[PDB]
Amino acid sequence: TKAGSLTIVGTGIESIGQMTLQALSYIEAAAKVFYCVIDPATEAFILTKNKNCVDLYQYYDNGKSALNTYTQMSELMVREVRKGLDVVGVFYGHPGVFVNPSHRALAIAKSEGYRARMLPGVSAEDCLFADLCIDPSNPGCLTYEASDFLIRDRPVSIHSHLVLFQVGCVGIADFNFTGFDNNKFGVLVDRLEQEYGAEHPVVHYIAAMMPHQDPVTDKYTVAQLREPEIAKRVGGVSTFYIPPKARKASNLDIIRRLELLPAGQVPDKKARIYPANQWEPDVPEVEPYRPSDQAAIAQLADHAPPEQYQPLATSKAMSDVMTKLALDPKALADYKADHRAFAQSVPDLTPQERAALELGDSWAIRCAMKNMPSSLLDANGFPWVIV
Amino acid sequence: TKAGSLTIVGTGIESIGQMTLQALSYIEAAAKVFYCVIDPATEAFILTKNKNCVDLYQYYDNGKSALNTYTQMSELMVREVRKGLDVVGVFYGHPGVFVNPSHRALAIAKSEGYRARMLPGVSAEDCLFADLCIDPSNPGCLTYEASDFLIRDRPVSIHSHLVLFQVGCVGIADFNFTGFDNNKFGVLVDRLEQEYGAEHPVVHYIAAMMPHQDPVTDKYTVAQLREPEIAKRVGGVSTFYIPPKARKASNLDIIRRLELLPAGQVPDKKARIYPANQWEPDVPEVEPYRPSDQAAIAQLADHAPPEQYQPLATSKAMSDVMTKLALDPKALADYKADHRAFAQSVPDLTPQERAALELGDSWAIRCAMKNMPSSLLDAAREASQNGFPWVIVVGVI
Ligand SMILES: C[S@@+](CC[C@H](N)C(=O)[O-])C[C@H]1O[C@@H](n2cnc3c(N)ncnc32)[C@H](O)[C@@H]1O
Ligand SMILES: C[S@@+](CC[C@H](N)C(=O)[O-])C[C@H]1O[C@@H](n2cnc3c(N)ncnc32)[C@H](O)[C@@H]1O
């Protein structure tokens, strides 16, 4: 209703490639773009996509508090929203993951009654999972800012993943163009030694920022982090991953109340699904091809899709319109204003496809796009993860 | 040297738009594509981008263990890798976040000496942060699978964010096409009552899967989750967000070791940085425009970029090649195989740009694309000494 909007989007971590299709489309559509990114290829790429961009990075300065910079960054965006423009703010990675000015600007915009939305992006933690070959679900994940971790004495779990952002700037309030002197780093190492022990592994992680670079995935002991040559390697794009120390056992009361037991059984805490976490100290080898695995693979020769499976059965015209709604913010806005009007103007849709667009309900769109078998409907069927 | 590769990529959560540019380019470049996605528009989109796709979802069945299905899905991918093909597996969201077969397939491919890589994507947790307007950094974030949370008695922190995936299938071991009766949901609700109290908020979160839909961001008390009408709403794509019950105070020893109070002390721990988390119970109003904020804004009129600021100073030819390397997997592989030959054949690069690309060093590329000041070039010679952005979470910093 009110003129003016703020859409905050991400670029991902690795230059250009980790930007989402929707982030790109919003950058292109914006009246004005404000950006804070940390590699020039991504900056150059953004400038090719919109003629009215402002680099927010110029609002940092030596001995200028980060908070004054962030107040300024968010005010530059919100000023343009107040003038009635469709504004896009761009921050590297996920624009809401360890970022101050995005949240400020959106909350101000929202409080003054403008449309305000954050679009998710690929974070450094997303890259971490991908590059270190770990899954937050197994065995759970604790994520902290390193200074907050120390100052608020945040709990660790030795049975779960621990991820620490900003380990290169422990206790730092003021910006500096030649980087952080991280001489309170030893305080973090003290905490890690107390929680995990001197010989426990810490993985120093830096996601590749350019498409041809390898990630840094260097394992050190907690004690090695005290060596000057090693502590020097930790910088402003460094994250630590600390693997679990032990496997947590199962709670017999919950096992009973969930009915996961037929008489006596033995699914051990150390009996793991392949593959095991390679960073975790003293983890045994797990066999990828056990007899049960071999038997499942043997069944592939006789495989047919089951009766209840729903094959895709759509059309070029329907696929085109669903793609357009995802990749054209203008088309989406029109559809959102008037389902019926929009749906009538779409060429080459079948009566079912048109009807389904008119309603906009998930089931109608699903039936138009998937053949639902008879065996299924005599009862929206989803995959999960076993941990 | 060994022929064949496995690249596993995500599609994000919201249909089509949340796919990354690199996920798309790998899908297009693949010899064979294997996918597991949960909306038809994303599925249809994938099929327009590659001619040799296989839907992995057909390997689920009633009375077939999930583990057997996952062994099968991974083996379909790795079989094609062993034949020397560039294979791409595709999973919705981030392909390594609450997903079994991706990790298995990659670990096998890696162990047998094939090129193997996972490309990250946008997870449901990423969507959650964006839609619920929260930052994992403030005040820290614990993320669990709901059944594992109960069975292993995983610890909560009442001072940090808690995110629980798979709240719609508590204790469920068998696959079935017609969904699941979440009959053991009450076991989760008891644990949440124990940890947080009956009146503590729980946010039922479902990210929009189609671009036109709105997310579900429905706040309930723990007690309200016992009502059948409310419990019925929690399904297979439901995640719970539980906000902090209290703010944690600061440690005086660390405040002293980090030298964060020259004057002694201030009088507050809940004098928050704007904005506050609007899901927290009894969160006070935070002032966005304090006198210090107004003073910072007043300085915008006279602002000039500092001397040390590095303006972009590149060329179309350089921007084009860096974009190509990011969006064309074949160009990237060629470049990686021989930096110098690749660099020689790029048209219209300046001598510095060519030299930078020949080396491949990130510092050299940066210096070819930005007008660097002497002081920053001085510091780099005698780890990367650049000012990078950082978040402030602790008010006293
Ligand atoms: C202000 S935050 C911004 C994070 C960003 N919004 C994201 O989505 O990851 C800066 C911190 O993110 C992490 N980070 C940024 N780039 C990284 C990279 N290439 N590899 C590993 N961690 C990184 C580091 O912990 C760094 O101190
Ligand atoms: C097997 S996992 C796969 C997760 C996916 N790889 C990702 O990156 O989020 C399924 C679980 O993810 C979460 N999930 C999936 N889709 C979601 C949505 N649209 N909104 C909220 N949570 C979702 C739910 O917790 C669900 O039970």
Numbering used by the authors:
A (entry chain B): 7 to 385, 396 to 403
B (entry chain A): 7 to 388, 393 to 407
Show passages lifted from the paper.
While chemical methylation of an amide bond uses a strong base to generate the imidate, OphA, the precursor protein of the fungal peptide macrocycle omphalotin A, self-hypermethylates amides at pH 7 using S-adenosyl methionine (SAM) as cofactor. Omphalotin A derives from the C terminus of the OphA protein, and it is the OphA protein that methylates its own C terminus using S-adenosyl methionine (SAM). Here, we report the structure of the peptide amide methyltransferase OphA including complexes with cofactor [SAM and S-adenosyl homocysteine (SAH)], cofactor analog, substrate, and product.
In the R72A-SAM complex (rmsd of 0.7 Å over 720 Cα atoms with OphAΔC6-SAH), peptide bonds of the substrate residues i−1 and i are flipped 180° relative to the conformation observed in OphAΔC6 and Y63F-SAH. Although the side chain of residue i+1 sits in the same pocket as seen in the OphAΔC6 protein, its backbone has a different hydrogen bond arrangement. Consequently, the amide nitrogen at position i (Trp400) points away from SAM and is no longer aligned for methylation. Despite the large conformational change in substrate peptide, conformations of other OphAΔC6 residues are essentially unaltered, pointing to rigidity at the active site. We therefore hypothesize that, by disrupting anchoring interactions, the flipped conformation can be adopted to relieve the steric clashes between SAM and the amide that would otherwise occur. We speculate that the flipped conformation of the substrate (seen in R72A, Y98A, and Y76F SAM complex structures) resembles an intermediate arrangement that occurs during translocation.
